[PDB]
Design a protein around this motif. Structure first.
Motif, PDB file in Angstrom:
ATOM      1  N   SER A 110      38.190   9.580  62.236  1.00  0.00           N
ATOM      2  CA  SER A 110      38.221   8.301  61.538  1.00  0.00           C
ATOM      3  C   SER A 110      37.275   7.267  62.207  1.00  0.00           C
ATOM      4  O   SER A 110      36.736   7.517  63.286  1.00  0.00           O
ATOM      5  CB  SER A 110      39.654   7.767  61.488  1.00  0.00           C
ATOM      6  OG  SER A 110      39.999   7.037  62.660  1.00  0.00           O
ATOM      7  N   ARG A 111      37.140   6.083  61.602  1.00  0.00           N
ATOM      8  CA  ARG A 111      36.355   5.002  62.177  1.00  0.00           C
ATOM      9  C   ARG A 111      37.033   4.315  63.337  1.00  0.00           C
ATOM     10  O   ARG A 111      36.420   3.428  63.915  1.00  0.00           O
ATOM     11  CB  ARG A 111      35.927   3.983  61.115  1.00  0.00           C
ATOM     12  CG  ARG A 111      34.853   4.569  60.248  1.00  0.00           C
ATOM     13  CD  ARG A 111      34.613   3.728  59.031  1.00  0.00           C
ATOM     14  NE  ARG A 111      33.487   4.267  58.274  1.00  0.00           N
ATOM     15  CZ  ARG A 111      33.116   3.840  57.073  1.00  0.00           C
ATOM     16  NH1 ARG A 111      33.787   2.867  56.470  1.00  0.00           N
ATOM     17  NH2 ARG A 111      32.076   4.390  56.458  1.00  0.00           N
ATOM     18  N   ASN A 142      28.650  -1.401  56.705  1.00  0.00           N
ATOM     19  CA  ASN A 142      29.812  -1.057  55.913  1.00  0.00           C
ATOM     20  C   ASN A 142      29.582  -0.951  54.431  1.00  0.00           C
ATOM     21  O   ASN A 142      30.450  -0.400  53.742  1.00  0.00           O
ATOM     22  CB  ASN A 142      30.926  -2.042  56.199  1.00  0.00           C
ATOM     23  CG  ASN A 142      31.627  -1.681  57.494  1.00  0.00           C
ATOM     24  OD1 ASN A 142      32.538  -0.835  57.505  1.00  0.00           O
ATOM     25  ND2 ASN A 142      31.204  -2.264  58.602  1.00  0.00           N
ATOM     26  N   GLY A 150      46.704   1.385  53.306  1.00  0.00           N
ATOM     27  CA  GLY A 150      46.940   2.654  53.966  1.00  0.00           C
ATOM     28  C   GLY A 150      45.715   3.305  54.523  1.00  0.00           C
ATOM     29  O   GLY A 150      45.563   4.521  54.422  1.00  0.00           O
ATOM     30  N   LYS A 151      44.839   2.508  55.142  1.00  0.00           N
ATOM     31  CA  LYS A 151      43.635   3.063  55.742  1.00  0.00           C
ATOM     32  C   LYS A 151      43.574   2.777  57.231  1.00  0.00           C
ATOM     33  O   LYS A 151      44.044   1.740  57.692  1.00  0.00           O
ATOM     34  CB  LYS A 151      42.369   2.492  55.076  1.00  0.00           C
ATOM     35  CG  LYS A 151      42.393   2.493  53.560  1.00  0.00           C
ATOM     36  CD  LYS A 151      41.562   3.608  53.008  1.00  0.00           C
ATOM     37  CE  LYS A 151      41.710   3.732  51.499  1.00  0.00           C
ATOM     38  NZ  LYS A 151      40.971   4.925  51.003  1.00  0.00           N
ATOM     39  N   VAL A 152      42.960   3.699  57.971  1.00  0.00           N
ATOM     40  CA  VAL A 152      42.673   3.559  59.390  1.00  0.00           C
ATOM     41  C   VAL A 152      41.134   3.317  59.507  1.00  0.00           C
ATOM     42  O   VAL A 152      40.355   3.822  58.701  1.00  0.00           O
ATOM     43  CB  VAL A 152      43.150   4.773  60.229  1.00  0.00           C
ATOM     44  CG1 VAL A 152      44.668   4.847  60.281  1.00  0.00           C
ATOM     45  CG2 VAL A 152      42.550   6.077  59.713  1.00  0.00           C
ATOM     46  N   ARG A 212      45.603   3.455  43.459  1.00  0.00           N
ATOM     47  CA  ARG A 212      46.198   3.086  44.741  1.00  0.00           C
ATOM     48  C   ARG A 212      45.835   1.676  45.185  1.00  0.00           C
ATOM     49  O   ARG A 212      46.709   0.954  45.678  1.00  0.00           O
ATOM     50  CB  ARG A 212      45.807   4.093  45.816  1.00  0.00           C
ATOM     51  CG  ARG A 212      46.525   5.419  45.678  1.00  0.00           C
ATOM     52  CD  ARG A 212      46.020   6.377  46.724  1.00  0.00           C
ATOM     53  NE  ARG A 212      46.985   7.444  46.974  1.00  0.00           N
ATOM     54  CZ  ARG A 212      46.894   8.322  47.971  1.00  0.00           C
ATOM     55  NH1 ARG A 212      45.866   8.277  48.817  1.00  0.00           N
ATOM     56  NH2 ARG A 212      47.826   9.255  48.128  1.00  0.00           N
ATOM     57  N   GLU A 249      41.363   6.670  44.198  1.00  0.00           N
ATOM     58  CA  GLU A 249      41.386   5.377  44.887  1.00  0.00           C
ATOM     59  C   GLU A 249      41.821   4.209  44.064  1.00  0.00           C
ATOM     60  O   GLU A 249      42.609   3.406  44.540  1.00  0.00           O
ATOM     61  CB  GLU A 249      40.016   5.064  45.514  1.00  0.00           C
ATOM     62  CG  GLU A 249      39.589   6.028  46.594  1.00  0.00           C
ATOM     63  CD  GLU A 249      40.455   5.914  47.832  1.00  0.00           C
ATOM     64  OE1 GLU A 249      40.634   4.778  48.333  1.00  0.00           O
ATOM     65  OE2 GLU A 249      40.972   6.959  48.287  1.00  0.00           O
ATOM     66  N   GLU A 270      40.134  -3.069  58.523  1.00  0.00           N
ATOM     67  CA  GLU A 270      38.703  -3.021  58.183  1.00  0.00           C
ATOM     68  C   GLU A 270      37.971  -2.926  59.510  1.00  0.00           C
ATOM     69  O   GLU A 270      38.012  -3.864  60.312  1.00  0.00           O
ATOM     70  CB  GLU A 270      38.197  -4.218  57.350  1.00  0.00           C
ATOM     71  CG  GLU A 270      38.507  -4.116  55.860  1.00  0.00           C
ATOM     72  CD  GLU A 270      37.943  -2.882  55.182  1.00  0.00           C
ATOM     73  OE1 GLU A 270      36.822  -2.443  55.547  1.00  0.00           O
ATOM     74  OE2 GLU A 270      38.624  -2.355  54.272  1.00  0.00           O
ATOM     75  N   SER A 271      37.334  -1.781  59.770  1.00  0.00           N
ATOM     76  CA  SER A 271      36.598  -1.512  61.014  1.00  0.00           C
ATOM     77  C   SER A 271      35.587  -2.605  61.328  1.00  0.00           C
ATOM     78  O   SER A 271      35.476  -3.014  62.482  1.00  0.00           O
ATOM     79  CB  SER A 271      35.900  -0.150  60.946  1.00  0.00           C
ATOM     80  OG  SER A 271      34.929  -0.063  59.909  1.00  0.00           O
ATOM     81  N   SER A 299      33.483  -3.018  50.697  1.00  0.00           N
ATOM     82  CA  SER A 299      33.481  -1.596  51.003  1.00  0.00           C
ATOM     83  C   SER A 299      34.662  -0.894  50.333  1.00  0.00           C
ATOM     84  O   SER A 299      34.483  -0.374  49.232  1.00  0.00           O
ATOM     85  CB  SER A 299      33.444  -1.359  52.521  1.00  0.00           C
ATOM     86  OG  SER A 299      34.562  -1.955  53.162  1.00  0.00           O
ATOM     87  N   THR A 300      35.874  -0.917  50.947  1.00  0.00           N
ATOM     88  CA  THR A 300      37.069  -0.242  50.431  1.00  0.00           C
ATOM     89  C   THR A 300      37.333  -0.486  48.958  1.00  0.00           C
ATOM     90  O   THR A 300      37.466   0.481  48.214  1.00  0.00           O
ATOM     91  CB  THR A 300      38.307  -0.582  51.280  1.00  0.00           C
ATOM     92  OG1 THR A 300      37.961  -0.441  52.662  1.00  0.00           O
ATOM     93  CG2 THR A 300      39.493   0.301  50.938  1.00  0.00           C
TER      94      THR A 300
HETATM   95  N1  GS8 Z   1      36.100   0.152  54.912  1.00  0.00           N
HETATM   96  C1  GS8 Z   1      37.178   0.822  55.685  1.00  0.00           C
HETATM   97  C2  GS8 Z   1      37.266   2.304  55.318  1.00  0.00           C
HETATM   98  C3  GS8 Z   1      38.435   3.005  55.994  1.00  0.00           C
HETATM   99  C4  GS8 Z   1      38.711   4.408  55.499  1.00  0.00           C
HETATM  100  O1  GS8 Z   1      38.251   4.832  54.442  1.00  0.00           O
HETATM  101  N2  GS8 Z   1      39.513   5.143  56.268  1.00  0.00           N
HETATM  102  C5  GS8 Z   1      39.919   6.500  55.962  1.00  0.00           C
HETATM  103  C6  GS8 Z   1      39.660   7.412  57.158  1.00  0.00           C
HETATM  104  S1  GS8 Z   1      40.165   9.143  56.923  1.00  0.00           S
HETATM  105  O2  GS8 Z   1      39.976   9.943  58.364  1.00  0.00           O
HETATM  106  C7  GS8 Z   1      41.394   6.591  55.586  1.00  0.00           C
HETATM  107  O3  GS8 Z   1      42.211   5.920  56.207  1.00  0.00           O
HETATM  108  N3  GS8 Z   1      41.714   7.396  54.573  1.00  0.00           N
HETATM  109  C8  GS8 Z   1      43.074   7.539  54.111  1.00  0.00           C
HETATM  110  C9  GS8 Z   1      43.179   7.416  52.593  1.00  0.00           C
HETATM  111  O4  GS8 Z   1      42.153   7.047  51.989  1.00  0.00           O
HETATM  112  O5  GS8 Z   1      44.272   7.711  52.062  1.00  0.00           O
HETATM  113  C10 GS8 Z   1      36.896   0.625  57.175  1.00  0.00           C
HETATM  114  O6  GS8 Z   1      35.706   0.658  57.521  1.00  0.00           O
HETATM  115  O7  GS8 Z   1      37.868   0.365  57.925  1.00  0.00           O
END
Ligand code: GS8
Ligand code: GS8
Ligand code: K
Lengths: 183, 183
Positions: free
Chosen positions: A10-11, A97, A50-52, B116, B113, A64-65, B98-99
Motif C-alpha cells: 500500500s501507499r 496523486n 475504507g482506504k489505507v 461505495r 468504486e 489521503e497519502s 484522486s480517490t
Molecule cells: N488517493 C488515496 C488512494 C488510497 C488507495 O487506493 N488505497 C488502497 C490500497 S490497496 O493495497 C486501498 O486501501 N484499497 C482498498 C479498497 O479500495 O477497498 C491515497 O493516496 O491515500
C-alpha cells in the motif's frame, strides 16, 4: 508517536519512507484488506472510504497519502511558513496523486500522457538533483514513489530519460527508502 | 490581480466558482489547447506539464486545481491557522482529485468504486448540510464539482443516494455556481 495504518504494497510505505527520512518513530498497524478489515466499523471510523493509508497523531486522524505527507512536512518544519511556500509543495503532492499517477498508470491515456510527463520531469531533473532544487524534500517522496513503481508495475524503464533513471536509482538506494518501500 | 489560465470545459471553471464564492476579481486568460498553445515555451513557463488550470499572482505561478483552491482558501483566511485544520481541508482536496475522481470516472473501476464512494458520502451528507459541517467551504467546491460532473459526463444520477442528490442540487442552485460551472 504517529500510528500509521497500512497494508502490504500500500501507499503507507510512502509515508513510512518519509517518516524514516525525518528520523521519526511510528507505530505501524496492518489492516488486513484480504479479509475486508478496512470495510469494518473500527477502520471506517478512521477513513470512511475504507482506504489505507491513514494516520492517528494522538486524537487527530488523517487520511489521503498526499495530505499525510503535507501534514508531516509542515509538522517537521521543512516548509518556509507562508501560503505560497506551502502552495508549491501542495502543487507537487496533487500532481503526484492525480496528473502523474493517471498519466503513467491509466492504459487508455498512457500513450499520449507518459512521454510528455517524463519529458518535462527529465528537463527539471537534468538541471537539479531533486525536484525543488539541491535538497531532497517531501516532493521527492511524493513524485519519486510514483516513478519508482513504473519498472515494478508496468515493466517499463527510463532508458530514454537518463535524468529520471538516475533520479529514481538514487532514491531507491536511500537507506530510508530501503527501510520502507525497499524492505 | 490573480490571472487564471483556463480553456473551454477545463477545471478552470472550478476555480471560477470559488473566485465567485469569495467575490474576488481576476483576469481570465484563455489558453488555446486545440492549437497547442499549452505546449509552447510561454505557457510551459507557467506550468511545465502544459496543463490548465494555473494561476499567476504577481511573480507567483501555481498549477493543479486542487493546490489553487487551497491557496485561494488560505489567502482569503477561510481556514483556521493550524497544520491539523489545513490537513483536513487538504485531505478532502486530495480525495476529490484522486480517490473520488478515479472511482467515478475510470471505467475499469467505476462498477466497484462508485457505489461505495456514494454510499460513504451518503452517510456523511445525511448528518450535515456540507462536508465539513454546517458551513459551506472550499471542500464543497472540490468534492461538489466532481459530483456535479456525474450527470453532465456520465448521464448517471444520484437517485439511490437522496442526501448526495440534495447536496448536489443545492450546490448547483448557488448563484456563484450558476455564474461559473452552470454557465
Ligand atoms: N488517493 C488515496 C488512494 C488510497 C488507495 O487506493 N488505497 C488502497 C490500497 S490497496 O493495497 C486501498 O486501501 N484499497 C482498498 C479498497 O479500495 O477497498 C491515497 O493516496 O491515500
Ligand atoms: N490534476 C490537474 C488536471 C489538469 C488537466 O488534466 N488539465 C487538462 C484540461 S483540458 O480542457 C489539460 O490542460 N490538458 C492539456 C493536455 O494534457 O495536453 C488539475 O486538477 O489541475
Ligand atoms: K495500539
Amino acid at each position: 508517536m504517529i500510528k500509521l495504518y497500512g497494508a502490504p504494497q500500500s501507499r503507507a510505505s510512502i509515508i513510512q519512507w518519509y517518516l524514516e527520512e525525518l528520523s521519526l518513530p511510528y507505530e505501524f498497524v496492518n489492516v488486513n484488506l484480504k479479509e475486508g478489515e478496512h470495510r469494518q466499523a473500527p477502520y471506517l471510523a478512521i477513513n470512511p472510504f475504507g482506504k489505507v493509508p491513514a494516520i492517528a497523531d494522538g486524537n487527530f486522524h488523517l487520511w489521503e497519502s498526499g495530505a499525510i505527507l503535507l501534514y508531516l512536512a509542515e509538522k517537521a518544519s521543512t516548509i518556509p511558513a507562508d501560503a505560497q511556500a506551502r502552495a508549491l509543495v501542495n502543487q507537487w503532492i496533487l500532481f503526484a496523486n492525480s496528473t502523474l499517477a493517471n498519466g503513467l498508470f491509466i492504459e487508455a491515456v498512457r500513450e499520449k500522457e507518459m512521454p510528455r510527463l517524463l519529458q518535462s520531469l527529465e528537463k527539471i531533473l537534468g538541471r537539479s538533483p531533486f525536484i525543488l532544487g539541491e535538497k531532497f524534500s517531501v516532493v521527492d517522496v511524493a513524485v519519486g514513489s510514483i516513478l519508482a513503481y513504473v519498472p515494478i508495475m508496468l515493466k517499463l524503464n527510463f532508458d530514454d530519460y537518463p535524468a529520471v533513471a538516475a533520479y529514481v536509482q538514487g532514491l531507491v538506494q536511500r537507506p530510508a527508502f530501503q527501510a520502507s518501500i525497499g524492505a
